[PDB]
Amino acid sequence: TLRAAVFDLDGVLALPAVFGVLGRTEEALALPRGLLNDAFQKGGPEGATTRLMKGEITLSQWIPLMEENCRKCSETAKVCLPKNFSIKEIFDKAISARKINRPMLQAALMLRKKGFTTAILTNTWLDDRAERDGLAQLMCELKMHFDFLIESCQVGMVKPEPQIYKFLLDTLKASPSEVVFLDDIGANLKPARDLGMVTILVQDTDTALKELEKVTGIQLLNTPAPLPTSCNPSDMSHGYVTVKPRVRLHFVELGSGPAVCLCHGFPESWYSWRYQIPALAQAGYRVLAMDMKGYGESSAPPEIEEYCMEVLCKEMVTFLDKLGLSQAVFIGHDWGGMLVWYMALFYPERVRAVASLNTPFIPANPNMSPLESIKANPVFDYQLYFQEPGVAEAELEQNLSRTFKSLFRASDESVLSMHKVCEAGGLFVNSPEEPSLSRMVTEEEIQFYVQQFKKSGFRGPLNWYRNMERNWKWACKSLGRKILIPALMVTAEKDFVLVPQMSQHMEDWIPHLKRGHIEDCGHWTQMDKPTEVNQILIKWLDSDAR
Amino acid sequence: TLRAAVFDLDGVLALPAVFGVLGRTEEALALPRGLLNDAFQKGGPEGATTRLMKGEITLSQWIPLMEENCRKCSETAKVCLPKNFSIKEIFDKAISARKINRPMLQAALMLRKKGFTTAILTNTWLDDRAERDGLAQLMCELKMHFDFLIESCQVGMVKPEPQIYKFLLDTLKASPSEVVFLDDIGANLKPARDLGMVTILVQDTDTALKELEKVTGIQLLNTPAPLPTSCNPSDMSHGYVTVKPRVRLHFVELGSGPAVCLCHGFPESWYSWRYQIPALAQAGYRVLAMDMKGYGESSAPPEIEEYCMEVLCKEMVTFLDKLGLSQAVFIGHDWGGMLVWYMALFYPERVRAVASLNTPFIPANPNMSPLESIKANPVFDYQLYFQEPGVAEAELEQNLSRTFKSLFRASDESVLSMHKVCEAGGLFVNSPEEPSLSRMVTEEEIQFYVQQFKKSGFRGPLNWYRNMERNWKWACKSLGRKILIPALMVTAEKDFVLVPQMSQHMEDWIPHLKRGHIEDCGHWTQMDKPTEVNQILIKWLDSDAR
Ligand SMILES: Nc1ncc(Cc2ccc(Br)cc2)s1
Ligand SMILES: Nc1ncc(Cc2ccc(Br)cc2)s1
Ligand SMILES: [Mg+2]
Ligand SMILES: [Mg+2]
């Protein structure tokens, strides 16, 4: 029956309500109870506050009208306002104190996910204060999670006028009885109730959510912890930079603040960072999530040596040159992790800080060919299978959906070992035709990867593994250096290839290294433990890169 | 005969030379003359400094080797180093003091423009200091102006070893006698001279440039002031954001720091900002230069109302939402200028600061239809011609090259008046078939616009003028507001349509308005007076938007 959910902002989606601050301010300054709420509301539908809420004047123009109203309420009440009474000061503090009320937001999210149309309906203002950015961020953060945001100052109408409710029903393309509306103000519910909407008077959050869960029949309270926000590819800003004449790099870009360049591994995509991108942007960074060379919408030339670490690094440098970035933070996973360490080694001046998920930094051994070194570890046998051009391509492109569904699995869901792949003659020889869907990924997400890899397949991606000797020779030039810029190594407990112990000597080469560690996390770290990744990165960025 | 020009960095392209700082430091601290230059150079080809310059160790690893060398030189000289002697401190100060030597850079530029291949050859280091970004910026700024930058620490070789010169001749694909090389160190010229290169020992800049002008036969000294750096479209990062399902916006993106969104007028392009984009990026901003809706690589739907100011503003807001920007600085010219004022009026919270070139802010007259208002000014007659769908399209698309060559002209070069266009029956009725090339633009630049407008022609662009009534109605909602965020108005003296006096009452509506004014500047402000525009914007940004 209920198909729409509408949330007030002040006192419902954002807390403390700013009305509650007029309460406290009165008491703090020992004024008459309600004097500040009277001056606020003076003149009703024709008073300063209604003109503000309808968008007729800006917040800076209203401030001095509210001052006047305070002089007038105080005179008629026979008190005096304190010396240094400041309306600007009180509202600056009140607006900056209000935050997103997390459990209401997650209830709105969850209803959106069970198919509800959702909106925010709020009486708000055109904010032109020096400090307006604070509110602009808050509204951006809430708004990406709703179908609509209706603002009184944008539509020229206010709660509780009956016209804004009709504009609501009309925006939602629904009838009064298919809508629930939560607001902390009884007067605003009054007209929604008249048209026959379910309403919930919002006092404490939990009681409201209990009423909401009862009326919608969907569980909202005590729900398990939700995943971080993901990205819809077609909602993103897509960037293209030609780094040399046959080669363009594609990236997805979100946020402002210090540049953070995310570098995925094999065989992945910018999209492997889908759970990090909104969180890092929201934490105050400019995220640039790459399609690395060979992948997705970046170019994929066929030659093996277009993919040695040297050319790849030089090209990531050019990428920064053309974008006008003197530095970025480099964060990599798997092959990306390898590349960011070498960015730190050869271009420290372009690298603000470096982090790797799973991939340790282990200096080249100048007295052993890197092929022998790879033979010394049975878990790396899949790299030998990758060597011969064509063979792995034929297997991995033969069935894309099967390929990614087999690969992208949590640590208890495995359907292949990395074990004597050469001898068995294939990566998938004894694995299912139609693997079951891992709990980590939806069918839709697999199909995004499948669609990416239809552009260029696995040649360019496998070539990252076909420059052992050339990479070894380059790396040997760096064997006198140390990494002395800020650096983070994150190990994954149940990565059975890139195991945590392989990182154990890293401090010899990176004496100030910081570490995170994630338990119960396989190889696909970002989508296995997104919440934990987000927390470790954001904390390390705020302390080391900011 | 000479086909290549090679510039040293320290003491040639950047000044003061850091070698000169060892001089001063010795005197400042009253040490033995040359003690600091001896410790620096200790051990020759096998000493700490050569390993640094070849890239074997990083700058942070060398610092304490130089300390040791200072202890050793001081002991053998029988002096003591001051308490608080700090190698890090001295080099931090010396590196931050060195700047681009402007006249050498402009000589290199000019030689590049007369067809020379140019490079920087420098002994430099892998800089991993906390403060490394300072140097990274400098190198980025120089490097975009040369064919090559060869760094000793990247190639594993140093001046004056003869191997780096061979690597030079080889990178330049030229023979020893087709090359001039300037360096402040005689020893480095010595081997270039042996292979038969022209060399110039660089002491004071002017004497060197005189020698360079003599040997190349190109005038370099006392040249007229050069234009600011322009943009090559295929060297830029190109951004795409879908703001609703039929509509994507394209932009070109350069720089980091606060977001600055540039909004061109009719009938133009992101490229109309080509002279502002590198300067604003270099000044510390993140520039986003739009193709506005209707143009270039942005979508151009056919319907007139897709182009009213309201829809356009809402869509620029969505553009910020998807990019993750809570604010940007909005800078507009002509129609763009109009749009940014309305951004300031209706979305102050998303606008960090607003500037307009030429377009004044003049509030809608609620008692006069805007068509009558347009009839009241004979210089706006071209807007009436624009009204009827098809008529202006047919004229302006008929010959693109003629169209832009006729339009894009300096104030003394006019070939059309905006005067009784309707009566004459065309904008170009009495103008040349093949206009001469204005001094403002090259043939190549016109052809860029021509190629842009082949994608969608003039429908979407003209539609910006076909919403007079709808724009008027929207604007009337704002007639109680003021613009109280930081705002700049720049007038152009010889814009005969958007004349400076039309801006004269702006302070009534924008009481804190700042102003620039550009003399001898027609309608095409950015390309008419780029140097002056850059200076007025950058100064206003640094004081009001930063
Ligand atoms: N646990 C793991 N560590 C590393 C892995 C890399 C890998 C990815 C794809 C193919 Br096909 C084979 C191996 S999987
Ligand atoms: N001096 C000027 N002010 C405004 C101008 C706008 C304009 C641009 C293109 C065509 Br076609 C006609 C007029 S030209
Ligand atoms: Mg409320
Ligand atoms: Mg020098």
PDB file of N, CA and C in Angstrom, chain B residues 177-252:
ATOM      1  N   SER B 177      76.673  19.727 -33.786  1.00  0.00           N
ATOM      2  CA  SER B 177      76.721  21.073 -34.387  1.00  0.00           C
ATOM      3  C   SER B 177      75.350  21.738 -34.677  1.00  0.00           C
ATOM      4  N   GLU B 178      74.259  20.985 -34.583  1.00  0.00           N
ATOM      5  CA  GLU B 178      72.938  21.578 -34.651  1.00  0.00           C
ATOM      6  C   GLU B 178      72.402  22.004 -33.259  1.00  0.00           C
ATOM      7  N   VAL B 179      73.224  21.838 -32.224  1.00  0.00           N
ATOM      8  CA  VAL B 179      72.799  22.120 -30.856  1.00  0.00           C
ATOM      9  C   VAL B 179      73.550  23.284 -30.218  1.00  0.00           C
ATOM     10  N   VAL B 180      72.758  24.167 -29.562  1.00  0.00           N
ATOM     11  CA  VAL B 180      73.292  25.104 -28.550  1.00  0.00           C
ATOM     12  C   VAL B 180      72.911  24.670 -27.113  1.00  0.00           C
ATOM     13  N   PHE B 181      73.851  24.800 -26.178  1.00  0.00           N
ATOM     14  CA  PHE B 181      73.626  24.381 -24.816  1.00  0.00           C
ATOM     15  C   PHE B 181      74.130  25.498 -23.908  1.00  0.00           C
ATOM     16  N   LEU B 182      73.255  25.940 -23.012  1.00  0.00           N
ATOM     17  CA  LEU B 182      73.621  26.977 -22.061  1.00  0.00           C
ATOM     18  C   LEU B 182      73.723  26.357 -20.688  1.00  0.00           C
ATOM     19  N   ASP B 183      74.808  26.648 -19.969  1.00  0.00           N
ATOM     20  CA  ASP B 183      74.955  26.151 -18.631  1.00  0.00           C
ATOM     21  C   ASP B 183      75.792  27.162 -17.879  1.00  0.00           C
ATOM     22  N   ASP B 184      75.610  27.285 -16.571  1.00  0.00           N
ATOM     23  CA  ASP B 184      76.405  28.271 -15.832  1.00  0.00           C
ATOM     24  C   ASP B 184      77.765  27.671 -15.419  1.00  0.00           C
ATOM     25  N   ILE B 185      78.031  26.388 -15.728  1.00  0.00           N
ATOM     26  CA  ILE B 185      79.255  25.718 -15.241  1.00  0.00           C
ATOM     27  C   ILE B 185      80.160  25.344 -16.392  1.00  0.00           C
ATOM     28  N   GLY B 186      81.365  25.952 -16.408  1.00  0.00           N
ATOM     29  CA  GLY B 186      82.316  25.752 -17.517  1.00  0.00           C
ATOM     30  C   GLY B 186      82.647  24.294 -17.767  1.00  0.00           C
ATOM     31  N   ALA B 187      82.878  23.577 -16.684  1.00  0.00           N
ATOM     32  CA  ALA B 187      83.148  22.153 -16.789  1.00  0.00           C
ATOM     33  C   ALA B 187      82.053  21.398 -17.578  1.00  0.00           C
ATOM     34  N   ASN B 188      80.784  21.785 -17.448  1.00  0.00           N
ATOM     35  CA  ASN B 188      79.701  21.079 -18.204  1.00  0.00           C
ATOM     36  C   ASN B 188      79.664  21.381 -19.673  1.00  0.00           C
ATOM     37  N   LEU B 189      80.204  22.526 -20.042  1.00  0.00           N
ATOM     38  CA  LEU B 189      80.210  22.929 -21.437  1.00  0.00           C
ATOM     39  C   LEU B 189      81.363  22.215 -22.126  1.00  0.00           C
ATOM     40  N   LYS B 190      82.444  22.072 -21.371  1.00  0.00           N
ATOM     41  CA  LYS B 190      83.672  21.420 -21.863  1.00  0.00           C
ATOM     42  C   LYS B 190      83.351  20.194 -22.764  1.00  0.00           C
ATOM     43  N   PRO B 191      82.638  19.163 -22.247  1.00  0.00           N
ATOM     44  CA  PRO B 191      82.356  18.044 -23.182  1.00  0.00           C
ATOM     45  C   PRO B 191      81.390  18.288 -24.310  1.00  0.00           C
ATOM     46  N   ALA B 192      80.469  19.249 -24.162  1.00  0.00           N
ATOM     47  CA  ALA B 192      79.536  19.552 -25.275  1.00  0.00           C
ATOM     48  C   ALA B 192      80.342  20.166 -26.403  1.00  0.00           C
ATOM     49  N   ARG B 193      81.194  21.145 -26.037  1.00  0.00           N
ATOM     50  CA  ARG B 193      82.182  21.767 -26.937  1.00  0.00           C
ATOM     51  C   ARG B 193      83.065  20.702 -27.681  1.00  0.00           C
ATOM     52  N   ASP B 194      83.648  19.736 -26.948  1.00  0.00           N
ATOM     53  CA  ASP B 194      84.394  18.578 -27.587  1.00  0.00           C
ATOM     54  C   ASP B 194      83.648  17.912 -28.705  1.00  0.00           C
ATOM     55  N   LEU B 195      82.339  17.642 -28.571  1.00  0.00           N
ATOM     56  CA  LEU B 195      81.577  17.014 -29.707  1.00  0.00           C
ATOM     57  C   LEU B 195      81.252  18.007 -30.764  1.00  0.00           C
ATOM     58  N   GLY B 196      81.496  19.310 -30.464  1.00  0.00           N
ATOM     59  CA  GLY B 196      81.215  20.396 -31.468  1.00  0.00           C
ATOM     60  C   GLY B 196      79.896  21.179 -31.358  1.00  0.00           C
ATOM     61  N   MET B 197      79.281  21.104 -30.181  1.00  0.00           N
ATOM     62  CA  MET B 197      78.135  21.954 -29.825  1.00  0.00           C
ATOM     63  C   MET B 197      78.574  23.419 -29.596  1.00  0.00           C
ATOM     64  N   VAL B 198      77.657  24.342 -29.934  1.00  0.00           N
ATOM     65  CA  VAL B 198      77.736  25.743 -29.531  1.00  0.00           C
ATOM     66  C   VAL B 198      77.397  25.692 -28.055  1.00  0.00           C
ATOM     67  N   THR B 199      78.109  26.449 -27.267  1.00  0.00           N
ATOM     68  CA  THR B 199      77.844  26.427 -25.885  1.00  0.00           C
ATOM     69  C   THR B 199      77.836  27.868 -25.501  1.00  0.00           C
ATOM     70  N   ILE B 200      77.187  28.148 -24.383  1.00  0.00           N
ATOM     71  CA  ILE B 200      77.184  29.467 -23.877  1.00  0.00           C
ATOM     72  C   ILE B 200      77.346  29.260 -22.409  1.00  0.00           C
ATOM     73  N   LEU B 201      78.383  29.883 -21.862  1.00  0.00           N
ATOM     74  CA  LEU B 201      78.657  29.921 -20.455  1.00  0.00           C
ATOM     75  C   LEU B 201      77.732  31.020 -19.949  1.00  0.00           C
ATOM     76  N   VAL B 202      76.869  30.673 -18.971  1.00  0.00           N
ATOM     77  CA  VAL B 202      75.779  31.570 -18.536  1.00  0.00           C
ATOM     78  C   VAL B 202      76.183  32.195 -17.244  1.00  0.00           C
ATOM     79  N   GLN B 203      76.543  33.472 -17.316  1.00  0.00           N
ATOM     80  CA  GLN B 203      76.729  34.304 -16.126  1.00  0.00           C
ATOM     81  C   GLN B 203      75.507  35.204 -15.904  1.00  0.00           C
ATOM     82  N   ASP B 204      75.560  36.490 -16.253  1.00  0.00           N
ATOM     83  CA  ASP B 204      74.304  37.284 -16.210  1.00  0.00           C
ATOM     84  C   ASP B 204      73.447  36.818 -17.395  1.00  0.00           C
ATOM     85  N   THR B 205      72.145  36.772 -17.171  1.00  0.00           N
ATOM     86  CA  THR B 205      71.201  36.375 -18.194  1.00  0.00           C
ATOM     87  C   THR B 205      71.287  37.139 -19.539  1.00  0.00           C
ATOM     88  N   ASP B 206      71.354  38.473 -19.509  1.00  0.00           N
ATOM     89  CA  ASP B 206      71.317  39.298 -20.747  1.00  0.00           C
ATOM     90  C   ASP B 206      72.469  39.033 -21.719  1.00  0.00           C
ATOM     91  N   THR B 207      73.678  38.862 -21.184  1.00  0.00           N
ATOM     92  CA  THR B 207      74.871  38.564 -21.995  1.00  0.00           C
ATOM     93  C   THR B 207      74.739  37.210 -22.691  1.00  0.00           C
ATOM     94  N   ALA B 208      74.377  36.192 -21.922  1.00  0.00           N
ATOM     95  CA  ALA B 208      73.966  34.886 -22.486  1.00  0.00           C
ATOM     96  C   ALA B 208      72.889  34.965 -23.593  1.00  0.00           C
ATOM     97  N   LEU B 209      71.834  35.769 -23.358  1.00  0.00           N
ATOM     98  CA  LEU B 209      70.745  35.865 -24.343  1.00  0.00           C
ATOM     99  C   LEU B 209      71.297  36.569 -25.584  1.00  0.00           C
ATOM    100  N   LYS B 210      72.259  37.486 -25.379  1.00  0.00           N
ATOM    101  CA  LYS B 210      72.847  38.244 -26.511  1.00  0.00           C
ATOM    102  C   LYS B 210      73.670  37.290 -27.353  1.00  0.00           C
ATOM    103  N   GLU B 211      74.481  36.480 -26.667  1.00  0.00           N
ATOM    104  CA  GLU B 211      75.213  35.392 -27.351  1.00  0.00           C
ATOM    105  C   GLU B 211      74.214  34.455 -28.012  1.00  0.00           C
ATOM    106  N   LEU B 212      73.143  34.084 -27.299  1.00  0.00           N
ATOM    107  CA  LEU B 212      72.146  33.153 -27.957  1.00  0.00           C
ATOM    108  C   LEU B 212      71.471  33.747 -29.174  1.00  0.00           C
ATOM    109  N   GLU B 213      71.196  35.043 -29.119  1.00  0.00           N
ATOM    110  CA  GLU B 213      70.505  35.715 -30.218  1.00  0.00           C
ATOM    111  C   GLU B 213      71.509  35.794 -31.375  1.00  0.00           C
ATOM    112  N   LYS B 214      72.780  36.015 -31.056  1.00  0.00           N
ATOM    113  CA  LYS B 214      73.777  36.113 -32.120  1.00  0.00           C
ATOM    114  C   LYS B 214      73.936  34.813 -32.798  1.00  0.00           C
ATOM    115  N   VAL B 215      74.087  33.744 -32.024  1.00  0.00           N
ATOM    116  CA  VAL B 215      74.310  32.441 -32.646  1.00  0.00           C
ATOM    117  C   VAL B 215      73.082  31.818 -33.365  1.00  0.00           C
ATOM    118  N   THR B 216      71.857  32.083 -32.907  1.00  0.00           N
ATOM    119  CA  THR B 216      70.660  31.516 -33.572  1.00  0.00           C
ATOM    120  C   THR B 216      70.070  32.432 -34.659  1.00  0.00           C
ATOM    121  N   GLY B 217      70.474  33.698 -34.645  1.00  0.00           N
ATOM    122  CA  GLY B 217      69.907  34.735 -35.527  1.00  0.00           C
ATOM    123  C   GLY B 217      68.431  35.050 -35.319  1.00  0.00           C
ATOM    124  N   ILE B 218      67.912  34.803 -34.113  1.00  0.00           N
ATOM    125  CA  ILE B 218      66.513  35.083 -33.791  1.00  0.00           C
ATOM    126  C   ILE B 218      66.462  36.118 -32.679  1.00  0.00           C
ATOM    127  N   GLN B 219      65.604  37.127 -32.816  1.00  0.00           N
ATOM    128  CA  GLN B 219      65.542  38.129 -31.757  1.00  0.00           C
ATOM    129  C   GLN B 219      64.891  37.610 -30.438  1.00  0.00           C
ATOM    130  N   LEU B 220      65.622  37.709 -29.325  1.00  0.00           N
ATOM    131  CA  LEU B 220      65.192  37.132 -28.035  1.00  0.00           C
ATOM    132  C   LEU B 220      65.151  38.147 -26.907  1.00  0.00           C
ATOM    133  N   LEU B 221      65.974  39.174 -27.005  1.00  0.00           N
ATOM    134  CA  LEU B 221      66.088  40.163 -25.957  1.00  0.00           C
ATOM    135  C   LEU B 221      65.262  41.377 -26.389  1.00  0.00           C
ATOM    136  N   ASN B 222      64.523  42.013 -25.479  1.00  0.00           N
ATOM    137  CA  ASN B 222      63.757  43.268 -25.829  1.00  0.00           C
ATOM    138  C   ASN B 222      62.596  43.005 -26.770  1.00  0.00           C
ATOM    139  N   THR B 223      62.226  41.740 -26.899  1.00  0.00           N
ATOM    140  CA  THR B 223      61.051  41.248 -27.643  1.00  0.00           C
ATOM    141  C   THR B 223      59.753  41.863 -27.115  1.00  0.00           C
ATOM    142  N   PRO B 224      58.708  42.024 -27.959  1.00  0.00           N
ATOM    143  CA  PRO B 224      57.500  42.483 -27.231  1.00  0.00           C
ATOM    144  C   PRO B 224      56.962  41.422 -26.167  1.00  0.00           C
ATOM    145  N   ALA B 225      56.254  41.885 -25.126  1.00  0.00           N
ATOM    146  CA  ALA B 225      55.634  41.004 -24.082  1.00  0.00           C
ATOM    147  C   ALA B 225      54.797  39.852 -24.684  1.00  0.00           C
ATOM    148  N   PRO B 226      55.090  38.613 -24.295  1.00  0.00           N
ATOM    149  CA  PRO B 226      54.447  37.465 -25.016  1.00  0.00           C
ATOM    150  C   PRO B 226      52.998  37.226 -24.551  1.00  0.00           C
ATOM    151  N   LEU B 227      52.132  36.577 -25.322  1.00  0.00           N
ATOM    152  CA  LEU B 227      50.781  36.219 -24.749  1.00  0.00           C
ATOM    153  C   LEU B 227      50.893  35.230 -23.532  1.00  0.00           C
ATOM    154  N   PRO B 228      49.871  35.130 -22.687  1.00  0.00           N
ATOM    155  CA  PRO B 228      49.955  34.038 -21.664  1.00  0.00           C
ATOM    156  C   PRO B 228      49.966  32.662 -22.399  1.00  0.00           C
ATOM    157  N   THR B 229      50.367  31.598 -21.712  1.00  0.00           N
ATOM    158  CA  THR B 229      50.289  30.226 -22.221  1.00  0.00           C
ATOM    159  C   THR B 229      48.835  29.881 -22.614  1.00  0.00           C
ATOM    160  N   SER B 230      48.645  29.283 -23.783  1.00  0.00           N
ATOM    161  CA  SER B 230      47.331  28.839 -24.239  1.00  0.00           C
ATOM    162  C   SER B 230      47.167  27.306 -23.974  1.00  0.00           C
ATOM    163  N   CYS B 231      46.146  26.647 -24.495  1.00  0.00           N
ATOM    164  CA  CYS B 231      45.953  25.222 -24.180  1.00  0.00           C
ATOM    165  C   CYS B 231      45.930  24.505 -25.481  1.00  0.00           C
ATOM    166  N   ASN B 232      46.535  23.342 -25.564  1.00  0.00           N
ATOM    167  CA  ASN B 232      46.291  22.487 -26.739  1.00  0.00           C
ATOM    168  C   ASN B 232      45.120  21.482 -26.392  1.00  0.00           C
ATOM    169  N   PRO B 233      43.968  21.563 -27.083  1.00  0.00           N
ATOM    170  CA  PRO B 233      42.818  20.722 -26.682  1.00  0.00           C
ATOM    171  C   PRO B 233      43.206  19.258 -26.422  1.00  0.00           C
ATOM    172  N   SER B 234      44.152  18.700 -27.181  1.00  0.00           N
ATOM    173  CA  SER B 234      44.385  17.256 -27.078  1.00  0.00           C
ATOM    174  C   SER B 234      45.371  16.987 -25.956  1.00  0.00           C
ATOM    175  N   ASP B 235      45.942  18.021 -25.375  1.00  0.00           N
ATOM    176  CA  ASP B 235      46.683  17.799 -24.135  1.00  0.00           C
ATOM    177  C   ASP B 235      45.918  17.953 -22.831  1.00  0.00           C
ATOM    178  N   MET B 236      44.614  18.116 -22.872  1.00  0.00           N
ATOM    179  CA  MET B 236      43.866  18.479 -21.669  1.00  0.00           C
ATOM    180  C   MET B 236      43.157  17.198 -21.173  1.00  0.00           C
ATOM    181  N   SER B 237      42.870  17.170 -19.867  1.00  0.00           N
ATOM    182  CA  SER B 237      41.943  16.232 -19.250  1.00  0.00           C
ATOM    183  C   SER B 237      40.547  16.683 -19.612  1.00  0.00           C
ATOM    184  N   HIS B 238      39.788  15.792 -20.237  1.00  0.00           N
ATOM    185  CA  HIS B 238      38.424  16.051 -20.710  1.00  0.00           C
ATOM    186  C   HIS B 238      37.466  15.327 -19.796  1.00  0.00           C
ATOM    187  N   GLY B 239      36.532  16.081 -19.165  1.00  0.00           N
ATOM    188  CA  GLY B 239      35.537  15.535 -18.221  1.00  0.00           C
ATOM    189  C   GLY B 239      34.138  15.439 -18.824  1.00  0.00           C
ATOM    190  N   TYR B 240      33.399  14.366 -18.476  1.00  0.00           N
ATOM    191  CA  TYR B 240      31.965  14.213 -18.869  1.00  0.00           C
ATOM    192  C   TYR B 240      31.059  13.831 -17.728  1.00  0.00           C
ATOM    193  N   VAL B 241      29.987  14.597 -17.523  1.00  0.00           N
ATOM    194  CA  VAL B 241      29.050  14.358 -16.434  1.00  0.00           C
ATOM    195  C   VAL B 241      27.670  14.390 -17.048  1.00  0.00           C
ATOM    196  N   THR B 242      26.914  13.293 -16.874  1.00  0.00           N
ATOM    197  CA  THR B 242      25.480  13.240 -17.238  1.00  0.00           C
ATOM    198  C   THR B 242      24.657  13.872 -16.148  1.00  0.00           C
ATOM    199  N   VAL B 243      23.990  14.976 -16.496  1.00  0.00           N
ATOM    200  CA  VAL B 243      23.177  15.634 -15.504  1.00  0.00           C
ATOM    201  C   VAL B 243      21.716  15.231 -15.503  1.00  0.00           C
ATOM    202  N   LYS B 244      21.235  14.607 -16.575  1.00  0.00           N
ATOM    203  CA  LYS B 244      19.918  13.996 -16.608  1.00  0.00           C
ATOM    204  C   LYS B 244      19.967  13.158 -17.854  1.00  0.00           C
ATOM    205  N   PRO B 245      18.939  12.319 -18.075  1.00  0.00           N
ATOM    206  CA  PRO B 245      19.223  11.269 -19.063  1.00  0.00           C
ATOM    207  C   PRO B 245      19.417  11.765 -20.469  1.00  0.00           C
ATOM    208  N   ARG B 246      18.857  12.865 -20.892  1.00  0.00           N
ATOM    209  CA  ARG B 246      19.419  13.132 -22.215  1.00  0.00           C
ATOM    210  C   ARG B 246      20.662  14.040 -22.358  1.00  0.00           C
ATOM    211  N   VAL B 247      21.215  14.457 -21.222  1.00  0.00           N
ATOM    212  CA  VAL B 247      22.095  15.619 -21.166  1.00  0.00           C
ATOM    213  C   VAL B 247      23.364  15.377 -20.419  1.00  0.00           C
ATOM    214  N   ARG B 248      24.462  15.411 -21.149  1.00  0.00           N
ATOM    215  CA  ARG B 248      25.795  15.327 -20.514  1.00  0.00           C
ATOM    216  C   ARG B 248      26.496  16.709 -20.683  1.00  0.00           C
ATOM    217  N   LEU B 249      27.271  17.130 -19.681  1.00  0.00           N
ATOM    218  CA  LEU B 249      28.122  18.322 -19.821  1.00  0.00           C
ATOM    219  C   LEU B 249      29.613  17.911 -19.941  1.00  0.00           C
ATOM    220  N   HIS B 250      30.305  18.526 -20.892  1.00  0.00           N
ATOM    221  CA  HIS B 250      31.719  18.316 -21.050  1.00  0.00           C
ATOM    222  C   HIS B 250      32.476  19.499 -20.457  1.00  0.00           C
ATOM    223  N   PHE B 251      33.672  19.254 -19.894  1.00  0.00           N
ATOM    224  CA  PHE B 251      34.489  20.323 -19.406  1.00  0.00           C
ATOM    225  C   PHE B 251      35.944  19.905 -19.539  1.00  0.00           C
ATOM    226  N   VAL B 252      36.842  20.887 -19.484  1.00  0.00           N
ATOM    227  CA  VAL B 252      38.247  20.656 -19.529  1.00  0.00           C
ATOM    228  C   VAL B 252      38.705  21.043 -18.116  1.00  0.00           C
TER     229      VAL B 252
END
